[PDB]
Write a protein that binds this DNA or RNA. Structure first.
Ligand SMILES: [Mg+2]
Lengths: 419, 469, 51
DNA sequence: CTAATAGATTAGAGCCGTCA
RNA sequence: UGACGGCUCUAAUCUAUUAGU
C-alpha cells in the first residue's frame, strides 16, 4: 500500500485538487486522483473500489459546498469506512475543509465526528499540517523529487496545448508593384518655367531638381500650364532607364542612386494621391498622412461582395478607411493601413478628435482577425481597374501597374484552435 | 510565396532546478529561488489609506480566483506561493494629515505644489529611516486620487522649484535616490477599487474578473522589491553580454541636451543572472541628435567592459548593443577604439515603426507568437506579440505588430539574434505576465532614464533596479 | 600591503577606505538585502590601530 | 545663418480595453 | 503611479533641391 487517494468534485474543485496533488507528488508521495489520468471511460468503478480496498493507505477527502452530498463522494466514503473497519487504523480518513460557505455545523453525518485540517484562511499552513500529520502517522514515501509533479503537469494539463506541424498561408497588407516605365526623364527647362510655379499642381507628377524637371511624363506634356514648351530641343533631355537605378547600378555627378530612389518614391506617392482623387473617394487629413473612405449609399447597400464598408454604431456611422505608402524596400510595394472614421449622418465627419478616438477605440473592440482582413481586401478589390491590377497614370502614355491581391506568406507551425 | 520560420519558447527556471514556460505556473508549482523570512512593511499615508492597505493585505492571504483558470492562472495565497510572511501585523504607520495635503495642492502652479507634496512625503520617510529603531524592507506610499489627478505635466487646474519635473512619481523616486529606500507607490483606487465609482453606481476600474492577476502582479512586485529572486533565465550562454542604450530629452532648461542611459545583463558564472543598470547619464548638447560624441562613447563602453571584467574576471567574448536608433561611423569608431582585440561587438537596432500585418485566412485568432520572416542576412521581422497556445489566447486584442530587427553594425547571425531577443522578453520583474513584447534591456534602461531626468542634483546614482522600478 | 607605511593615520585611512568602498558598493548597486554587515578584522590590524 | 518642397528617423504625451 | 497592448495627436533633426546672401 503506497497510494494516497484524493476524492473531490470533478469540475468544481479542480484548481485546489490539482495544486495539492502536484505539491504532494513533488514532496515524493504516491497519489491517486481522477485528474491525473487521460483516456478514461470504463475505468470508473470496478477500479476505484479495487484501489480503495487494496492500494490506498490514506484517504484524503476534500470537503466543500460541492463535495457535500455528492453520490460518487458518498459511495467512496462508504467504501473507505468499510476499509477502515477492515484494518486496524482509526486515522484512515482525513477531511480537508476549504469552503468558507460550508459551516462546520453543516457537515454530512459520515465525517461530523472527525478532526479535520483547516485550509480556509491559508493553504500553506494547511499543507504544513498535512505534512506533519503524515510524518506523525508514518505514511510511506520516497525521496523528495519535484520532477514527478513537473512531468505529470506536462503530460496531463499541458496535453492538448502545444504547437502543431501544420502548413498555413497568411495574407498581408502589401501590394506588389508590377510595372515601371522604361525611362526617367529630366527636362532642361532652363529659365523657361516660372520661378514660383508650384509644380505640385501640374497634370502629371513632376519634381523640381536643379534647373531640370524629374518626371515620367512625355517631353512636351503639360503644355496647358506651361505655354512656352513647344519650342524645346528634345536632345537636351537626360534619360536614365528605370531598371538600372532600381537595381542600384547607376551613379553620376548629376544625381546619386539614393536621390533617384527618393524622387521615384515621391512620384509614386503623388501618383497614388492623384489617382485616389480620380477614384472619387472621401479624404481625411490625419496628423501626418491622408486616409480615404467611402460615403453612405455609394455602394449597393454599403456592401462590396458581401462585405460591409460602412455601418452603424448608435448615433454615429463608422467607415472603414485605408492609407497607402509606396516603398522600395524590401521589394517595391504599396503598404496599406486600416482606420475607422465616424460621421453624424454618413456624409459629414464629426469635428472632434477626442470623440473620434473614443469611438475608434470602442468600435474595434469586437473586430477580430477575419473582420479586419475581409474589410481590407474588400476595399482594395473595390479599387481594382479591370481584372487583376490597378494603374497609376504617370503621363499621357505612362502607367505603373500595382496588384490588387496582397502578398502571401507560408508557415509550417500552427495551433489546433480547440474552441 | 514568402517563407516563415518558427522559434521555440526559451523557458525560465524556478526552485529545485525545474523549468517552465510560465512564471505563474512555476511559482505555484515550485517556488522562488532564494529564501526570504518575511516582509516588514512601512506604510506612510492617511488613516483611510492605512485601513485600505491593511484590508488588502488581509485579502491576499487566501486563494483569489479569476473568471477563467485556463487564460489566467489563479492565486493560491501569498504564503503558498512565496514561502514567506507578508501580513498586516508587521506594519509601521507614519500618519499624514489630510489638512496638509489639501493645503499644498492649491498653489495654481504644478511645479510648486508637486515639489511641496514630494517634500512632505519624503521628509517623513527620511526622518523615519534616519532616527528610528524599526527595520523596514519596503515603504508603501498610499496616494489619494485628487493628488493623482492634478499632478500630471499636462494638467490644468479647473523658479526655485522649476528645475524639477512636474511629475509626482518621477520626482519622488529621484529625490529619494541618495538614501536608497525601496518604495512602492499605490493609488487609493487601486487597492480598494470596489468603493470608487462613477456617476452610475459602478466601479471606474473593474477588476472583478482579474483579481487574481492583480494579486499576482502586486505580490511579485512586493517580493522583488524586498530582495527576493522570483526566477531566472535558463539558457543564457557564457561570454555574452547584453547592453541596452536609451536616449531621453533632459529639457527643463535652455539646452535640450539629450541624455543616454544603459542597462547591462550577463551570466554571473555561478549560474546566476546579473541584470543591473549601467548609467552615468551621458550627454549630447546638440539638439535632435541621438548619437554619442567619441569621448562619451569611449567612457560608456569602457565602464561596461570594466564592470563585466570585475564581476567575471575576464573580458566578454561577445557584446550585443541593442538600441532603438542607428549608429554612425564616429560612434562605432569610438566604440571600437576601446574594445579588446579578441571581442566581437555587434550593434543591433530594434524598431517598431514598420507597417506589416499577417492575417490568418479562416479563423478569428491571430498569428502564432514565435513566427519570424527573414528579409535578408542582416534584417528580419519577429512576432513577439501573438497567439500563445499554452493559455488559449493571444497577448494582444487586434492584429499584432512585429519588431523589425536589423544587424546595423558588426557581423552576427540573425537567427541567434532573434532567439536572444525572444528570450530577453521573459524578465519583466515589474510585472507578472506570460511574456513581454519588448526585450527588457530596452525597457528598464528607459525607466532609469526617465527617473534620473527629473532632477539635476543626482550624482553617482545606485544601479540596483529596486530603487527605480 | 597597506599595513606597512609607518604612518598610523595613513594606514588607518587606507584600511577604512578599502573596507567601506566594498561595503558601499555592495549596498547601492545590488538587489541583495543585508541587514547587519559583520566585519571580521585580523588581530594585527586591531593592535596597530592606536594613536 | 536663413523661408519653402519631399523622404526618412526620432522622441513626447494622452486616451482606451482587459468579461463574454 | 498594479500591468500590458493598441491607437491618435504634437515636436525635432538629417539629407537633396529651390529661393534668401
Ligand atoms: Mg512596480
Amino acid at each position: 500500500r503506497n497510494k494516497i487517494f484524493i476524492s473531490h468534485a470533478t469540475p468544481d474543485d479542480n484548481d485546489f485538487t490539482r495544486w495539492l496533488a502536484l505539491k504532494l507528488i513533488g514532496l515524493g508521495y504516491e497519489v491517486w486522483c481522477d485528474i491525473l489520468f487521460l483516456d478514461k471511460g470504463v475505468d470508473f468503478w470496478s477500479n476505484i473500489e479495487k484501489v480503495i480496498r487494496e492500494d490506498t493507505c490514506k484517504f484524503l477527502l476534500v470537503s466543500s459546498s460541492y463535495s457535500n452530498q455528492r453520490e460518487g463522494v458518498l459511495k467512496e466514503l462508504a467504501v473507505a469506512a468499510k476499509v477502515k473497519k477492515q484494518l486496524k487504523d482509526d486515522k484512515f480518513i482525513i477531511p480537508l475543509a476549504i469552503d468558507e460557505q460550508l459551516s462546520y455545523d453543516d457537515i454530512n453525518i459520515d465525517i461530523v465526528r472527525l478532526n479535520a485540517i483547516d485550509f480556509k484562511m491559508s493553504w500553506a499552513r494547511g499543507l504544513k499540517d498535512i505534512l506533519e500529520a503524515f510524518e506523525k502517522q508514518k505514511v510511506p514515501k520516497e525521496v523528495a523529487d519535484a520532477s514527478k509533479s513537473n512531468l505529470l503537469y506536462q503530460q496531463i494539463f499541458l496535453h492538448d496545448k502545444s504547437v502543431i506541424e501544420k502548413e498555413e498561408i497568411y495574407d498581408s497588407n502589401w501590394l506588389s508593384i508590377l510595372s515601371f516605365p522604361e525611362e526617367l526623364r529630366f527636362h532642361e527647362y532652363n529659365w523657361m518655367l516660372p520661378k514660383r510655379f508650384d509644380v505640385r499642381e501640374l497634370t502629371f507628377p513632376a519634381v523640381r531638381y536643379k534647373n531640370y524637371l524629374c518626371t515620367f511624363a512625355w517631353a512636351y506634356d503639360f503644355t496647358y500650364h506651361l505655354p512656352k514648351t513647344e519650342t524645346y530641343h528634345k536632345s537636351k533631355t537626360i534619360r536614365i532607364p528605370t531598371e538600372e537605378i532600381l537595381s542600384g547600378s547607376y551613379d553620376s555627378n548629376f544625381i546619386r542612386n539614393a536621390e533617384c530612389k527618393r524622387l521615384i518614391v515621391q512620384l509614386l506617392n503623388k501618383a497614388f494621391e492623384l489617382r485616389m482623387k480620380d477614384k472619387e473617394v472621401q479624404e481625411y487629413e490625419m496628423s501626418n498622412k491622408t486616409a480615404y473612405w467611402l460615403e453612405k449609399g455609394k455602394l449597393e447597400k454599403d456592401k462590396f461582395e458581401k462585405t460591409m464598408l460602412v455601418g452603424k454604431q448608435k448615433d454615429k456611422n463608422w467607415h472603414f478607411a485605408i492609407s497607402g505608402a509606396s516603398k522600395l524596400y524590401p521589394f517595391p510595394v504599396l503598404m496599406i493601413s486600416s482606420h475607422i472614421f465616424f460621421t453624424a449622418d454618413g456624409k459629414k465627419l464629426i469635428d472632434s478628435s477626442s470623440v473620434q478616438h473614443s469611438s475608434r477605440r470602442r468600435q474595434g473592440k469586437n473586430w477580430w482577425n477575419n473582420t479586419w482582413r475581409t474589410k481590407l481586401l474588400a476595399f482594395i478589390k473595390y479599387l481594382s481597374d479591370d481584372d487583376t491590377s490597378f494603374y497609376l497614370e504617370m503621363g499621357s502614355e505612362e502607367k505603373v501597374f500595382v496588384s490588387n491581391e496582397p502578398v502571401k506568406f507560408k508557415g509550417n507551425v500552427s495551433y489546433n484552435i480547440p474552441e | 510565396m514568402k517563407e516563415l520560420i518558427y522559434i521555440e519558447e526559451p523557458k525560465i527556471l524556478f526552485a529545485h532546478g525545474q523549468k517552465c514556460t510560465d512564471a505563474r505556473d512555476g511559482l505555484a508549482l515550485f517556488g522562488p529561488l532564494n529564501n526570504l523570512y518575511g516582509i516588514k512593511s512601512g506604510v506612510i499615508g492617511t488613516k483611510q489609506g492605512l485601513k485600505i492597505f491593511r484590508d488588502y493585505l488581509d485579502h491576499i492571504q487566501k486563494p483569489i480566483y479569476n473568471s477563467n483558470s485556463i487564460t489566467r492562472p489563479m492565486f493560491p495565497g501569498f504564503e503558498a506561493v512565496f514561502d514567506c510572511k507578508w501580513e498586516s501585523t508587521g506594519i509601521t504607520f507614519k500618519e499624514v494629515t489630510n489638512e496638509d495635503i489639501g493645503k499644498f495642492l492649491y498653489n495654481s502652479s504644478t511645479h510648486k505644489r508637486t515639489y511641496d507634496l514630494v517634500s512632505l512625503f519624503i521628509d517623513k520617510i527620511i526622518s523615519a529611516n534616519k532616527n528610528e529603531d524599526e527595520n523596514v524592507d519596503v515603504w508603501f506610499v498610499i496616494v489619494p486620487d485628487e493628488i493623482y489627478k492634478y499632478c500630471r505635466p499636462n494638467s490644468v487646474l479647473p523658479a526655485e522649484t522649476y528645475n524639477y519635473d512636474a511629475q509626482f512619481h518621477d520626482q519622488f523616486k529621484a529625490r529619494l535616490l541618495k538614501h536608497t529606500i525601496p518604495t512602492q507607490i499605490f493609488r487609493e483606487s487601486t487597492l480598494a477599487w470596489r468603493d470608487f465609482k462613477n456617476a452610475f453606481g459602478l466601479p471606474i476600474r473593474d477588476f472583478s474578473k482579474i483579481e487574481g492577476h492583480l494579486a499576482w502582479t502586486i505580490s511579485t512586485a512586493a517580493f522583488y522589491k524586498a530582495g527576493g529572486k522570483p526566477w531566472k533565465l535558463s539558457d543564457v550562454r557564457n561570454g555574452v553580454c547584453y547592453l541596452g542604450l536609451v536616449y531621453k530629452k533632459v529639457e527643463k532648461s535652455k539646452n535640450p541636451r539629450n541624455a543616454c542611459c544603459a542597462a547591462q545583463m550577463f551570466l554571473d558564472n555561478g549560474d546566476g543572472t546579473v541584470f543591473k543598470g549601467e548609467v552615468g547619464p551621458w550627454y549630447n548638447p546638440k539638439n535632435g541628435q541621438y548619437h554619442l560624441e567619441p569621448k562619451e562613447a569611449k567612457a560608456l563602453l569602457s565602464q561596461s567592459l570594466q564592470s563585466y571584467k570585475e564581476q567575471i574576471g575576464e573580458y566578454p567574448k561577445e557584446v550585443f548593443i541593442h538600441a532603438k536608433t542607428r549608429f554612425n561611423h564616429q560612434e562605432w569608431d569610438a566604440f571600437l577604439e576601446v574594445t579588446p582585440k579578441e571581442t566581437n561587438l555587434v550593434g543591433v537596432t530594434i524598431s517598431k515603426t514598420k507597417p506589416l500585418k499577417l492575417y490568418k485566412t479562416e479563423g478569428d485568432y491571430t498569428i502564432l507568437r514565435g513566427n519570424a520572416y527573414v528579409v535578408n542576412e542582416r534584417s528580419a521581422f519577429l512576432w513577439t506579440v501573438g497567439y500563445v497556445p499554452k493559455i488559449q489566447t493571444a497577448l494582444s486584442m487586434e492584429v499584432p505588430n512585429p519588431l523589425f530587427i536589423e544587424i546595423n553594425k558588426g557581423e552576427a547571425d540573425i537567427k541567434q539574434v532573434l532567439k536572444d531577443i525572444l528570450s530577453l522578453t521573459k524578465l519583466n520583474y515589474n510585472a507578472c505576465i506570460f511574456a513581454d513584447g519588448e526585450p527588457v534591456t530596452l525597457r528598464f534602461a528607459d525607466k532609469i532614464g526617465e527617473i534620473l531626468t527629473a532632477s539635476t542634483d543626482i550624482k553617482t546614482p545606485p544601479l540596483a533596479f529596486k530603487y527605480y522600478i
